[PDB]
Structures are given as structure tokens and as C-alpha cells.
């Protein structure tokens, strides 16, 4: 009722209470990114075609090989707007560093709330240094989710994932350059195709260059189980 600027009410569901979101946002260069948490179809995409010109199609890869291994991703300071980005291995990230909902991908989108580091649900908006997200993961079906993405305190999308495939590295489904390089073996986040990321309410925030991707009702299987979900593709 008081302080009318909070309306982060746009289906960030799955969190026992809203006090489970970590909300440490700075916008210190004053660019408008933080306003995107609340105003969703306003992204200025005029710089984007340049940003994603930088990323290179799956066509740069070669059939053959056969011995797919796994490797830890780099986690370069590049924003992970590109599919090919090899996430850093998922870990224990302090809530002191993050702004807005945190999503992991099973592939289906899921939300992680702030916990005790022991693992007990915290309800302090992410203020105390005892508030963290535990994102350690293993690929489903046995594991929990393939990877997670969220937002920096200062307007940078962060990415967290299971080790991409080797042989040359593939963190999504690139079945054309090897028939076992499926998503279920190599998927490390929301990108299930070099052209398709999964849809969730904060995709346009975290992945704002995907503004014009089309949204499809799809079906995927990790070890035979069926996830119905929606994906955005170009």
C-alpha cells in the first residue's frame, strides 16, 4: 500500500514467499537495465544485431570424431548472450551479488530461492551474508537441472552450468556435428538448440537480445521422461 514502486509481481512463481528473491541491484551507470525487472517490453534492441553478430553458427564444427568427453567451461567475462557460451560449473553463489529471480533449467524452467548455505529457506530478500543460492548440479535425469542464469547486482547476466561436451566444445544440442551430442548429454542451461532457448518470464530480461525469437510449444525427453515446455527460437 505504501511505496508504490514495488510491482515485481509478474509470475516469478515457485518461491514460498516473495522475500525469497535476492534483490541487490545497482544500475550504477544509469542505463535502464534495472527498470527492465518491472517493465518488460521496452528493451532497446538497437545494439543487439552487432552483439550477436559476434557469435558464430554451429556450421563451424566438423562431423567425424566420435569420442565425446566432457570439460569444465571457461566462464569468460563475455555476457552469455550466445548459445555457444561455456558456463562455469554451477556453485554456491552469494545473494549479495544477484538481482531478481534465479532460474535453472531441467530443461523446464525452475526458480531457486535463497537458503542458509546449510540449505534452510531464508526470507531476508538476500541481505545477510548468510543468504546464498546453492546451485551445485548434475545433469538430469539423475541430477536436478542442466544449468542456471540470473542477473548481476550491476546489470550483467550470469551463467552457471554442467560441463559442456568435448569434441571442440558443445554446451547444447549440436546433433549435426555428432549424433550423441544431444541436449541430455551436453545441455548446460536454457539453450536447447544453437537457435533455441527455453522460455520463462525473465528470459527477455536475462537474454534481452532474444526479443524477437518466436515462442513454440515443444516436447523434450531426458532419459525417456517427457517434459512439455515452451521455447523461443529464431
Amino acid at each position, epitope marked *: 500500500p505504501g511505496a508504490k514502486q514495488n510491482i515485481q509481481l509478474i509470475n516469478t512463481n515457485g518461491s514460498w514467499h516473495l522475500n525469497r528473491t535476492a534483490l541487490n541491484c545497482n544500475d550504477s551507470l544509469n542505463t535502464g537495465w534495472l527498470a527492465g525487472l518491472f517493465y518488460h517490453h521496452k528493451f532497446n534492441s538497437s545494439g543487439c544485431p552487432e552483439r550477436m553478430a559476434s557469435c558464430r553458427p554451429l556450421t563451424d564444427f566438423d562431423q567425424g570424431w566420435g569420442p565425446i568427453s566432457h570439460a569444465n567451461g571457461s566462464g569468460p567475462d563475455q555476457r552469455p548472450y550466445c548459445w555457444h557460451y561455456p558456463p562455469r560449473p554451477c556453485g554456491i553463489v552469494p545473494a549479495k551479488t544477484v538481482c531478481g529471480p534465479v532460474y535453472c533449467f531441467t530443461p523446464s524452467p525452475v526458480v531457486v530461492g535463497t537458503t542458509d548455505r546449510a540449505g534452510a529457506p531464508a526470507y531476508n530478500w538476500g541481505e545477510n551474508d548468510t543468504d546464498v543460492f546453492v546451485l551445485n548440479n548434475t545433469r538430469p*535425469p539423475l*541430477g536436478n537441472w542442466f544449468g542456471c542464469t540470473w542477473m548481476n547486482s550491476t546489470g550483467f547476466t550470469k551463467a552457471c552450468g554442467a560441463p559442456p561436451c568435448a569434441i571442440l566444445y558443445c554446451p547444447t544440442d549440436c546433433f549435426r556435428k555428432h549424433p550423441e551430442a544431444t541436449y541430455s548429454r551436453c545441455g548446460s542451461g536454457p539453450w536447447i538448440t544453437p537457435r533455441c532457448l527455453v522460455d520463462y518470464p525473465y528470459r527477455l530480461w536475462h537474454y534481452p537480445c532474444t526479443i524477437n525469437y518466436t515462442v513454440f510449444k515443444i516436447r523434450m525427453y531426458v532419459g525417456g521422461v517427457e517434459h512439455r515446455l515452451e521455447a523461443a527460437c529464431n
Partner: antibody
Amino acid sequence: QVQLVQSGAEVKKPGASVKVSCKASGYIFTSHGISWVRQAPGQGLEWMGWISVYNGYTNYAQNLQGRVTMTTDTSTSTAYMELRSLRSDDTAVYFCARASQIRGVDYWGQGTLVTVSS
Amino acid sequence: SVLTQPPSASGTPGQRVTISCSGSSSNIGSNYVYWYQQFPGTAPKLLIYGNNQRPSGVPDRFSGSKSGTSASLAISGLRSEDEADYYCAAWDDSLSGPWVFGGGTQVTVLG
């Protein structure tokens, strides 16, 4: 220190059922899944099945004919394998082991001896 | 077993014993081999995962390779302590799957 320790050994009559426990400590329980492997005295290792701690997916060894059901408790950091309709070849040490896509079935409890004798 | 191991092998201390393991195109030919050491009355211990990697805490002499449809574990500098049961395991995508074990191979330091 990633540890699994199992419930003690029990004697069961043929046709009875048993439920073996297993406590995980030393990693994020929901990060990996949990597998069960029994060994009959003198024989090789038998894969019984798989459960996902996080989402609950299961895979069961098909010669167990829907006898075994596997369950976790995220609070207790404990996994439960239950076998029904016990027969004398169910006599076996029942192991509890962690499973993931890359490290496979990596870390094993001590085992539980299950003897089905009347 | 879906994976076939010789039941025994043996060597005199200081020798390098190999072990064989053979499968299909839907396990070794396409998935991760693992190796376990079981002493009698012990739970098996993981020795090798993803075909060649020793977990932290495994002597360098335990090496494991793979090619085509068969994988091998090596034990250089064979000591009395190595006498044990050794199992090869693997993912498997055919109806035999999803996880498959080997028959086992008892290795004897020739005393």
C-alpha cells in the same frame, strides 16, 4: 568427506518385505541421484535401479518385476530401497551408492546384509 | 553379464597386469567405462570414471583406456594389496541398459 552409511542387517522370511536405509553426508543431496546394487554371496554385482533425489525419476532393473520401490527423504538426506515378496535368491548384500551422469555410480555405502531364510 | 571380463588374471609383484572388458556399440562403443576394486567384505571403490580419470586418491599406476568396443584397466607395479575383484561398468542405451556391470576379474599376486 562424502559418506553413505546404511541401515543394519536384518533376517526376513520368504514372502516378507524389507526396507533398507542409507544416509548421505558430504555433498548436496539433491545434486546427484541414488542407485542400489545388490551382491549375492559369491557372485557379481547386480544393478537394481536408480532414483533422482531432486525430481524423483526412477529406473528399475526389469528382472525385479516391479518388486522394488525406491524413495528419498530430502529432509533426512536418506534413500530407501524396499523389496517385496522376498525369495531365497534375494539373499544378498544390498549396497547404496551415489550416481550422476559423468562420474557414474561413484561412492558406495558399506552394504546391508539381507538374508531370507525360513 | 552384458560386459564380459576374464574371470582371473595374475602376476608376480612389480609386474603390470592388464584386464579386459568387452561390450556392444551401445555401451563402451558410446559411453563411459568405469572401474571398481572390491576387497572381500568391502564395498567396491571407484577407481576409474569416464574411461580414464582416477578420482582424487588413486595411485597413478591404475590406468584405464578404451577403444572401439572394449576397455582395459592396467595395474603397474603389482603389489600384494592389489589382489581383489575388479569390475568394469558402463552406461548402455539398448534394452540391456541403462547401467551394466562386468562379470568381475579376480587378480592374484602370484605368491
